């Protein structure tokens, strides 16, 4: 500004002024802004930021490509002067900065946070992942404007931060100015004074990339007044900044947005693809260390396995998750199935469902003294997206939990209004729960109601309810010991993402009828064991379209919906 | 923007209006000479009535209305002394009345953008110190609370009373003399607070929420807080 | 400059297995950025004589020269890399591991200070990752000028100082923030093993810097071998420079024991000297040490091995004097007690770092008592912070804790021996039961060595012992004694007989161990065994009694119970938490009531 320019800023100054004149990409879409703004002024905005891509970068200069990736400190500012000459220069109107941005493939500097360490700080960092935290937007002071009232003019004087400048100029301070010369009180004036407003937000790894076990690292990006609007937590996203260390980021760039597959693999896949004999065997290979319970574990398949996710036209979307609940006597292997699917889904996180420090799964409150305000903590069902969740122990978790749980079933979303934010969240996941009776033991001469400790309005939330029995019986009891004394885990994981990333089931006439039939000869256990609600009349097709896509059929069959009303007699019978 | 000419035409608007006794403002001024009234409304209408009277014979206009709409805590203590500087004499710290202002409608608007109905989700962050006209329910309201704006403090050793400004929320007791004879002497005799001569005002908290269909899909009405003083 | 040569040589020129082993992996790490590389002293030593004593001698002065010098050879490895496919380059940071020696903490002493020193040990704490500098723009604020320090492995009378004058006065420097390098360090706690601690003073510790590369690699509470410089700040601590972790006369001797056919009776005779009875506790105490047969199973959904032993009794009969023997003979174990104990905690404790009061975790037995057994005293005295924990990890293993910024699941090889005097089912439900060197190496190396199974015509009497015990205690369960038989004592019953199986160090089993098996098992059950009636009594009393509940509460049962000659104060208790845990809402409401209202 005030130093005078050496040839090290008029070199990079006119070799991003001829960058600009060979790719008018750039220049077409600033004089669509600039057209933009002066219809919206013509009429009485968009936040003055062009998005470059960096694959037209390479092959024009590769220097300048290199010092880019190396000393953005000395390469970014004489890029944004020539954006600025260049938008003086292609406005011929009277009458303000103007940013950068970048997009494209990295290399090397596309990293996980947790392998982000102390080297390659001043270079620009590419970093995705989950955000546990977005603060309070907090206006800051630049440029106050006083008025001084005896001899009646206006005063300003304006501040500086030591992070928004990716470079180098003298840091100092200044008070904020209550005297003017040789003494005569004068007041401010914020009517013109600007606000720019900044926020503070954090991210950590995805776990489905990181090596689950270990702990989330997390780090903080500063945010400018143009893309405050467009950060909440829950949601997956990749941001581009600079590893600043006066250490965090200065976030430029946000994106809002696993087993690799050969061609070998997709033949096995596609030669189990047309035998019907497949669905019992692979119900029958993921736990062999369990006996028996062969239905149950067919709806824990159709359960990791998915739906469809329905999205409505100009209306609400349809759950396509399915919640199965089991209870029964504590002696079998309900604590032993959690372990098994969560080390073979494709993610997956369990919780105790009682012993969480917040209000529950979803989130909680905290207080920092870094911004001396109040920050959003994400304990749980807001990270998994897509996956499944299982919680032991439902009946020793307390109803804000359930309250909680009661809003996001069919909801498959959530809400929060708190001091200072107002939002909702989008996290389509599916619950595993197990129970225990408040008798401590069950036999079939009780009744099936008040054993389960639970209110009728979770009985309707959760569609699949097992009961499994232990009474002693001689006969049945005998080859447990020799069987515990006595297809494979990566294929099944394969199989399943290959089913829900590429086919998708339809309905046909063959399959209405029959769920049609079934659903009005049920709607019988009202009258002798069990409520039917019109839930399960969505939770009837579901299954079906599981068993569907297990084939991998493009459309249903008759026999889905035959195999839909097996489980259910032995789940409600 | 400059100072020394929109005072001009601040203080030359006011005497000479007849669109809306006979000029209104001085009307107004007598009013209040009579002490009848402690309120003062001014509205955009009769600034874009006199600037098509000023335009229309030749005139510069010098824009008001593109200069009142961004800093009005500025304009607000700038055209108080335009008004000051003229009063008629009565018939029946010295501010008797309170300045306040009120918008252009939609119905002047199209009649030759500034008053727009604005959400709190619209708000942007940038426009802090614009004037907006902001819809929405009223659920959070506090009682009538007297706020000082001056401080008063009173000696008995010289007798020249000080006065001084407060801004923010809470002050600072000063205890030390700082009046124009205790500068040139030893003593710095104890002063005394007046709760007659400091001048109060009527401040209260609002809370202002989100109307519930202006709101987007799935979002929640957020609250926003409104400080108001006076009548 | 000839140590550069001869450094550049042993990089460029070392060969095992016909193969180069610092070149390619000096490309691999340069093509991911990772900027270090494992070197083996037995390596250098086996290469260089040169390097090796004066590298032990002082290695302040020699170590920067070969980074330095690694640095030079990675320059042109990066400007050779980058012109095949697709500027500034940091002071490349070495790690360097050996087992050559193994010395303790109390063989430390005031010889040989600032050299080499490789030791064992637990990390008790990695709280803290501080900034420092590696090059740094520095300015003045009054004549204009401005220069850069660099430094690359000096990270209280250091060589770190900002210079007094470049007139400007003292100290006219400001520190240009908007170009520098950040290097991350750590502070770090580390105690010897406590197994073998003398009795009369508490385990001393030490306090390590950990530098740029190997930051965050070490969990807090595991079996760490630490090698760096013993350095001084007098106080002394060590300057990591490379990390890693987990006579034939005495298997002569172990092989004559291991004949003997009455050998688990001396053992048993050997493991009370004064203890009067009770062969089925030293039994079970000395059969828990292992567990049991551990399988990885193909699917992924492996078995567990360990099992659960619980005394209990009167205060004597040695509950806490056994335990002394079982803590300082099994291979890893520490004894501690119920919440935690004096200036020591079995639950991950977190505490202030006195400096600046920081936060920061304490690892108790938990952690610590990896690939062993845990062993406790007064279960009784348990907090609610440390029982959910305690709760999971005797069923499951693993141990989770998650708080601000730590996220991380402890594996937790953990048995445990507790001794004792809501609780009703975690005491009757996730408990199974209720010379010395030379006997320490045979338990590890069976505990490492061996994977045994069993045999079909031994598990067809497990399967008769369990068709009869389910079709006798029948009798006694549908009588409404209420107390259990599950599939999980079948399962310990299993593991009881893999440990007794193991000991002979024989991969199969026979009926010899399941004789025993049972027997153990059956005083288990014997120290064990010593709704629509209750529901009918409750219900009917809420319901057709009084609705509001009020003037009907613990009084009026009282009464009617009283009364009526069935109420116990757990049957009571228990029923009435059976009707709020039925979620009789309204027995919500009463409990929210008319409990405390009391009638």
């Given at each position: 500004t005030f130093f005078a320019p050496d040839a090290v800023f008029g070199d990079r100054v006119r070799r991003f002024q001829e960058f600009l004149d060979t790719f008018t990409s750039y220049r077409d879409s600033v004089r669509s802004i600039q057209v933009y703004n002066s219809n919206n002024a013509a009429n009485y905005i968009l936040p003055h930021r062009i998005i470059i891509s960096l694959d037209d970068l390479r092959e024009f200069d590769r220097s300048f490509w290199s010092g880019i990736l190396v000393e953005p400190a000395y390469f970014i500012p004489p890029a944004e002067k020539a954006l600025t000459d260049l938008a003086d220069s292609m406005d011929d109107v009277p009458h303000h900065p103007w940013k950068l941005s970048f997009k494209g493939s990295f290399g090397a500097h596309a990293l996980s946070p947790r392998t982000?360490?102390?080297?390659?700080?001043?270079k620009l960092v590419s970093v995705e992942g989950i955000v546990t935290k977005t603060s309070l937007v907090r206006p800051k002071l630049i440029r106050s404007v006083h008025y001084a009232a005896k001899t009646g003019r206006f005063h300003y004087r304006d501040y500086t931060d030591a992070?928004?400048?990716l470079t180098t100029r003298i840091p100092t301070p200044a008070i904020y100015p209550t005297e003017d010369t040789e003494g005569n009180k004068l007041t401010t004036e914020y009517?013109?004074?600007?606000?720019?407003d900044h926020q503070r937000i954090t991210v950590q790894e995805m776990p489905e990339m990181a090596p689950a076990g270990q702990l989330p690292r997390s780090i903080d990006v500063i945010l400018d007044d143009?893309?405050?609007?467009?950060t909440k937590p829950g949601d997956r996203v990749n941001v581009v900044g600079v590893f600043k260390s006066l250490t965090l980021i200065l976030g430029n760039t946000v994106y809002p947005l696993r087993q690799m597959l050969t061609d070998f693999d997709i033949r096995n896949i596609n030669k189990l693809?047309?035998?019907?004999?497949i669905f019992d065997i692979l119900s029958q290979s993921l736990?062999?260390?369990?006996?028996?319970?062969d239905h149950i574990k067919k709806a824990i398949l159709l359960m990791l396995m998915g739906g469809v996710e329905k999205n409505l036209e100009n209306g609400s979307h349809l759950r396509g998750d399915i919640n199965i609940l089991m209870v029964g006597?504590?002696?079998?292997a309900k604590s032993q199935l959690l372990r098994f699917v969560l080390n073979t889904a494709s993610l997956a996180i369990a919780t105790?469902?009682?012993?969480?420090?917040?209000?529950?799964?979803?989130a909680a409150v905290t207080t920092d003294r870094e911004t001396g305000e109040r920050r959003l903590e994400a304990?749980?069902?807001?990270?998994?997206?897509?996956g499944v969740v299982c919680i032991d122990?439902?009946?020793?978790?307390?109803?804000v939990d359930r309250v909680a749980i009661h809003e996001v079933m069919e909801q498959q979303t959530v809400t929060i209004a708190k001091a200072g934010i107002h939002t909702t969240l989008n996290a389509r996941c599916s619950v595993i729960a197990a129970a225990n009776p408040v008798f401590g033991q069950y036999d079939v001469?009780?009744?099936?109601?008040?054993?389960?400790?639970?209110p009728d309005s979770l009985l309707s939330r959760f569609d699949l309810l097992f009961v499994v029995t232990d009474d002693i019986n001689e006969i049945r009891d005998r080859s447990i010991s020799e069987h515990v004394l006595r297809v494979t885990i990566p294929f099944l994981r394969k199989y399943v993402q290959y089913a829900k990333e590429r086919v998708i089931p339809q309905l046909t006439q063959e399959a209405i009828n029959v769920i049609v039939k079934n659903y009005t000869d049920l709607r019988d256990d009202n009258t002798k064991k069990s409520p039917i609600t019109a839930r399960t009349l969505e939770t009837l097709i579901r299954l079906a379209t599981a068993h569907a896509k297990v084939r991998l059929s493009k459309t249903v069959n008759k026999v889905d919906a035959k195999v839909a009303a097996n489980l259910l007699r032995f789940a409600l019978l | 923007v400059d100072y020394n000419n929109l005072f001009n035409e601040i203080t030359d608007f006011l005497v000479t209006f007849?669109?809306?006794?006979?000029?209104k403002y001085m009307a107004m001024l007598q009013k209040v000479a009579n002490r009848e009234l402690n309120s003062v409304i001014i509205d955009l209408d009769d600034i874009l009535q006199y600037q098509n009277e000023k335009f229309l014979q030749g005139?510069?206009?010098?824009?008001?209305v593109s200069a009142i709409q961004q800093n009005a805590n500025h304009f607000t203590e700038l055209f108080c002394r335009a008004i000051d500087n003229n009063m008629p004499l009565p018939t029946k710290l010295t501010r008797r009345y309170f300045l306040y202002f009120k918008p252009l409608s939609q119905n002047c608007a199209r009649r030759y953008i500034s008053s727009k109905p604005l959400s709190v989700r619209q708000?942007?962050?940038?426009?802090?110190g614009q004037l907006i006209t902001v819809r929405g329910i009223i659920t959070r309201v506090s009682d009538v609370k007297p706020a000082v704006e001056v401080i008063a403090y009173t000696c008995?050793?010289?007798?020249?009373e000080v006065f001084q400004e407060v801004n923010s929320r809470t002050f600072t007791p000063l205890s030390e003399c700082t009046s124009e004879e205790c500068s040139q002497n030893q003593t710095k005799g104890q002063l005394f607070m007046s709760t007659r001569a400091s001048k109060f005002s009527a401040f209260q908290e609002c809370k202002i929420q989100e109307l519930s269909q202006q709101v987007?899909?799935?979002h929640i009405p957020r609250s926003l807080n409104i400080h108001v003083n006076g009548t | 400059t000839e140590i550069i040569k001869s450094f550049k040589n042993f990089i460029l020129e070392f060969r095992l297995d016909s193969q180069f082993i610092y070149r390619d992996q000096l490309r691999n790490n340069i093509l991911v950025k990772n900027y270090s590389l494992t070197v083996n002293m037995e390596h250098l030593i086996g290469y260089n004589e040169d390097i090796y004593k004066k590298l032990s001698d002082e290695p302040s002065d020699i170590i920067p020269l070969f980074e330095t010098a690694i640095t030079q050879v990675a320059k042109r490895i990066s400007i050779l890399s980058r012109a095949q496919s697709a500027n500034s380059l940091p002071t490349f940071q070495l790690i360097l591991n050996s087992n050559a020696n193994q010395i303790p903490?109390?063989?430390?002493?005031?010889?040989?200070?600032?050299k080499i020193v490789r030791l064992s040990g637990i990390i008790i704490s990695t709280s803290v990752l501080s900034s420092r500098a590696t090059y740094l723009s520095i300015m003045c604020r009054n004549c204009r000028h401005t220069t850069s320090i660099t430094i690359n492995n000096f990270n209280?009378?250091?060589?770190?100082s900002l210079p007094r004058?470049?007139?400007?006065?003292?100290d006219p420097y400001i520190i240009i923030h908007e170009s520098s390098k950040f290097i991350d360090q750590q502070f770090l706690k580390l105690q010897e093993i406590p197994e073998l601690v003398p009795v009369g003073e508490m385990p001393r510790n030490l306090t390590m810097t950990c530098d740029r590369?190997?930051?965050?690699k070490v969990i807090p509470g595991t079996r760490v071998t630490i090698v760096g410089i013993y350095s001084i700040y007098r106080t002394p601590y060590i300057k990591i420079l490379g990390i890693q972790s987990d006579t034939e006369e005495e298997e002569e001797e172990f092989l004559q024991l291991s004949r003997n056919p009455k050998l688990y009776e001396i053992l048993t005779n050997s493991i009370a000297?004064?203890?009067?009875?009770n062969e089925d506790i030293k039994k079970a105490i000395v059969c828990?040490?292992?567990?049991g047969s551990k399988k990885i199973l193909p699917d992924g959904m492996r078995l567990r091995g360990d099992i659960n032993v619980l005394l209990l009794g009167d205060?004597?009969?040695?509950?806490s004097q056994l335990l002394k023997f079982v803590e300082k003979v099994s291979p890893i174990a520490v004894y501690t007690s119920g919440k935690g104990s004096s200036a020591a905690g079995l639950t991950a404790s977190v505490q202030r770092d006195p400096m600046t009061r920081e936060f920061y975790l304490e690892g108790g037995a938990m952690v610590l008592a990896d690939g062993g057994v845990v062993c406790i005293d007064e279960?009784?005295?348990?907090?609610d912070e440390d029982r959910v924990a305690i709760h999971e990890a005797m069923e499951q293993q693993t141990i989770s804790i998650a708080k601000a910024g730590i996220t991380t699941v402890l594996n937790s090889r953990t048995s445990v021996l507790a001794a004792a005097n809501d609780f009703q089912t975690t005491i009757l439900s996730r408990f199974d039961m209720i010379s010395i060197e030379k006997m320490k190496r045979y338990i590890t190396y069976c505990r490492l060595k061996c994977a045994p199974r069993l045999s079909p015509q031994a598990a067809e009497k497990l399967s008769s012992n369990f068709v009869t015990i389910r079709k006798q205690l029948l009798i006694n369960e549908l009588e409404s004694t209420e107390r259990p038989i599950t599939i999980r004592q079948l399962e310990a019953i299993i593991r009881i007989t893999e440990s007794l199986a193991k000991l002979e160090l024989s991969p199969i089993a026979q009926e010899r161990h399941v004789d025993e098996a049972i027997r153990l098992f059956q005083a288990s059950t014997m120290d064990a065994a010593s709704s629509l009636s209750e529901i009918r009594r409750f219900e009917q009393e809420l319901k057709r009694r009084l609705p509001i509940g009020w003037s009907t509460s613990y009084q009026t049962l009282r009464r009617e119970f009283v009364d009526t000659h069935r109420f116990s104060q757990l049957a009571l208790d228990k029923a009435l938490y059976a009707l709020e845990k039925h979620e009789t809402i309204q027995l919500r409401h009463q409990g929210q009531n008319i409990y405390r209202s009391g009638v």
């Amino acid at each position: 500004t005030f130093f005078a320019p050496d040839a090290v800023f008029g070199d990079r100054v006119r070799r991003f002024q001829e960058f600009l004149d060979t790719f008018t990409s750039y220049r077409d879409s600033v004089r669509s802004i600039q057209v933009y703004n002066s219809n919206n002024a013509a009429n009485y905005i968009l936040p003055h930021r062009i998005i470059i891509s960096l694959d037209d970068l390479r092959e024009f200069d590769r220097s300048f490509w290199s010092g880019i990736l190396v000393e953005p400190a000395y390469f970014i500012p004489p890029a944004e002067k020539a954006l600025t000459d260049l938008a003086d220069s292609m406005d011929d109107v009277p009458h303000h900065p103007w940013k950068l941005s970048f997009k494209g493939s990295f290399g090397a500097h596309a990293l996980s946070p947790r392998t982000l360490t102390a080297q390659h700080l001043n270079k620009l960092v590419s970093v995705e992942g989950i955000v546990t935290k977005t603060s309070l937007v907090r206006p800051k002071l630049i440029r106050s404007v006083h008025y001084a009232a005896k001899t009646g003019r206006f005063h300003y004087r304006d501040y500086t931060d030591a992070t928004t400048t990716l470079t180098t100029r003298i840091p100092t301070p200044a008070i904020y100015p209550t005297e003017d010369t040789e003494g005569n009180k004068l007041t401010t004036e914020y009517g013109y004074s600007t606000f720019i407003d900044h926020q503070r937000i954090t991210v950590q790894e995805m776990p489905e990339m990181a090596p689950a076990g270990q702990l989330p690292r997390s780090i903080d990006v500063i945010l400018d007044d143009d893309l405050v609007d467009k950060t909440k937590p829950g949601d997956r996203v990749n941001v581009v900044g600079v590893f600043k260390s006066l250490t965090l980021i200065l976030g430029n760039t946000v994106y809002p947005l696993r087993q690799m597959l050969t061609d070998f693999d997709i033949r096995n896949i596609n030669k189990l693809s047309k035998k019907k004999d497949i669905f019992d065997i692979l119900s029958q290979s993921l736990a062999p260390s369990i006996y028996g319970h062969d239905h149950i574990k067919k709806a824990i398949l159709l359960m990791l396995m998915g739906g469809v996710e329905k999205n409505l036209e100009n209306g609400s979307h349809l759950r396509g998750d399915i919640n199965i609940l089991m209870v029964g006597d504590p002696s079998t292997a309900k604590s032993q199935l959690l372990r098994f699917v969560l080390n073979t889904a494709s993610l997956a996180i369990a919780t105790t469902g009682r012993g969480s420090s917040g209000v529950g799964l979803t989130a909680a409150v905290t207080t920092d003294r870094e911004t001396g305000e109040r920050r959003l903590e994400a304990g749980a069902m807001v990270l998994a997206d897509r996956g499944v969740v299982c919680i032991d122990e439902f009946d020793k978790m307390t109803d804000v939990d359930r309250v909680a749980i009661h809003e996001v079933m069919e909801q498959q979303t959530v809400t929060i209004a708190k001091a200072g934010i107002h939002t909702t969240l989008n996290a389509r996941c599916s619950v595993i729960a197990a129970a225990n009776p408040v008798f401590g033991q069950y036999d079939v001469n009780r009744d099936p109601h008040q054993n389960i400790a639970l209110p009728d309005s979770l009985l309707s939330r959760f569609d699949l309810l097992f009961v499994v029995t232990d009474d002693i019986n001689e006969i049945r009891d005998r080859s447990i010991s020799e069987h515990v004394l006595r297809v494979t885990i990566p294929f099944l994981r394969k199989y399943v993402q290959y089913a829900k990333e590429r086919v998708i089931p339809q309905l046909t006439q063959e399959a209405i009828n029959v769920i049609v039939k079934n659903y009005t000869d049920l709607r019988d256990d009202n009258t002798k064991k069990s409520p039917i609600t019109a839930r399960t009349l969505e939770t009837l097709i579901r299954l079906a379209t599981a068993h569907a896509k297990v084939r991998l059929s493009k459309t249903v069959n008759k026999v889905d919906a035959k195999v839909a009303a097996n489980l259910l007699r032995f789940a409600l019978l | 923007v400059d100072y020394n000419n929109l005072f001009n035409e601040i203080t030359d608007f006011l005497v000479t209006f007849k669109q809306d006794k006979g000029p209104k403002y001085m009307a107004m001024l007598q009013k209040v000479a009579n002490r009848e009234l402690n309120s003062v409304i001014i509205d955009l209408d009769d600034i874009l009535q006199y600037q098509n009277e000023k335009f229309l014979q030749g005139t510069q206009a010098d824009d008001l209305v593109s200069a009142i709409q961004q800093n009005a805590n500025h304009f607000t203590e700038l055209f108080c002394r335009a008004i000051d500087n003229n009063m008629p004499l009565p018939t029946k710290l010295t501010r008797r009345y309170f300045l306040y202002f009120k918008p252009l409608s939609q119905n002047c608007a199209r009649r030759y953008i500034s008053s727009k109905p604005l959400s709190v989700r619209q708000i942007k962050g940038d426009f802090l110190g614009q004037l907006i006209t902001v819809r929405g329910i009223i659920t959070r309201v506090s009682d009538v609370k007297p706020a000082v704006e001056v401080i008063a403090y009173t000696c008995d050793q010289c007798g020249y009373e000080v006065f001084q400004e407060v801004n923010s929320r809470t002050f600072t007791p000063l205890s030390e003399c700082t009046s124009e004879e205790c500068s040139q002497n030893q003593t710095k005799g104890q002063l005394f607070m007046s709760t007659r001569a400091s001048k109060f005002s009527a401040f209260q908290e609002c809370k202002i929420q989100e109307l519930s269909q202006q709101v987007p899909v799935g979002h929640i009405p957020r609250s926003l807080n409104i400080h108001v003083n006076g009548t | 400059t000839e140590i550069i040569k001869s450094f550049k040589n042993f990089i460029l020129e070392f060969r095992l297995d016909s193969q180069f082993i610092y070149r390619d992996q000096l490309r691999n790490n340069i093509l991911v950025k990772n900027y270090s590389l494992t070197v083996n002293m037995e390596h250098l030593i086996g290469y260089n004589e040169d390097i090796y004593k004066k590298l032990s001698d002082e290695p302040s002065d020699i170590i920067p020269l070969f980074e330095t010098a690694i640095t030079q050879v990675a320059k042109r490895i990066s400007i050779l890399s980058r012109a095949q496919s697709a500027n500034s380059l940091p002071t490349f940071q070495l790690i360097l591991n050996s087992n050559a020696n193994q010395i303790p903490l109390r063989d430390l002493d005031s010889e040989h200070v600032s050299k080499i020193v490789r030791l064992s040990g637990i990390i008790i704490s990695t709280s803290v990752l501080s900034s420092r500098a590696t090059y740094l723009s520095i300015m003045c604020r009054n004549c204009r000028h401005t220069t850069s320090i660099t430094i690359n492995n000096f990270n209280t009378g250091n060589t770190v100082s900002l210079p007094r004058s470049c007139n400007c006065g003292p100290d006219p420097y400001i520190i240009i923030h908007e170009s520098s390098k950040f290097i991350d360090q750590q502070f770090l706690k580390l105690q010897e093993i406590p197994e073998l601690v003398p009795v009369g003073e508490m385990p001393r510790n030490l306090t390590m810097t950990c530098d740029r590369y190997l930051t965050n690699k070490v969990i807090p509470g595991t079996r760490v071998t630490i090698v760096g410089i013993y350095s001084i700040y007098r106080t002394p601590y060590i300057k990591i420079l490379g990390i890693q972790s987990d006579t034939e006369e005495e298997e002569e001797e172990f092989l004559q024991l291991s004949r003997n056919p009455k050998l688990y009776e001396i053992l048993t005779n050997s493991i009370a000297p004064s203890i009067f009875g009770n062969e089925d506790i030293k039994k079970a105490i000395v059969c828990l040490l292992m567990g049991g047969s551990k399988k990885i199973l193909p699917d992924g959904m492996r078995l567990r091995g360990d099992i659960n032993v619980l005394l209990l009794g009167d205060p004597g009969t040695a509950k806490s004097q056994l335990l002394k023997f079982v803590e300082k003979v099994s291979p890893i174990a520490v004894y501690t007690s119920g919440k935690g104990s004096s200036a020591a905690g079995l639950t991950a404790s977190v505490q202030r770092d006195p400096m600046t009061r920081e936060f920061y975790l304490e690892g108790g037995a938990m952690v610590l008592a990896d690939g062993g057994v845990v062993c406790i005293d007064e279960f009784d005295k348990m907090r609610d912070e440390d029982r959910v924990a305690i709760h999971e990890a005797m069923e499951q293993q693993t141990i989770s804790i998650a708080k601000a910024g730590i996220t991380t699941v402890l594996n937790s090889r953990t048995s445990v021996l507790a001794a004792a005097n809501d609780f009703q089912t975690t005491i009757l439900s996730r408990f199974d039961m209720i010379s010395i060197e030379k006997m320490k190496r045979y338990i590890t190396y069976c505990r490492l060595k061996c994977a045994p199974r069993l045999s079909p015509q031994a598990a067809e009497k497990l399967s008769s012992n369990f068709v009869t015990i389910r079709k006798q205690l029948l009798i006694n369960e549908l009588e409404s004694t209420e107390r259990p038989i599950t599939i999980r004592q079948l399962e310990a019953i299993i593991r009881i007989t893999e440990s007794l199986a193991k000991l002979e160090l024989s991969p199969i089993a026979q009926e010899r161990h399941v004789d025993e098996a049972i027997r153990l098992f059956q005083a288990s059950t014997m120290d064990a065994a010593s709704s629509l009636s209750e529901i009918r009594r409750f219900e009917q009393e809420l319901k057709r009694r009084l609705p509001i509940g009020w003037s009907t509460s613990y009084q009026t049962l009282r009464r009617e119970f009283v009364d009526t000659h069935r109420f116990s104060q757990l049957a009571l208790d228990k029923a009435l938490y059976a009707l709020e845990k039925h979620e009789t809402i309204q027995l919500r409401h009463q409990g929210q009531n008319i409990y405390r209202s009391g009638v």
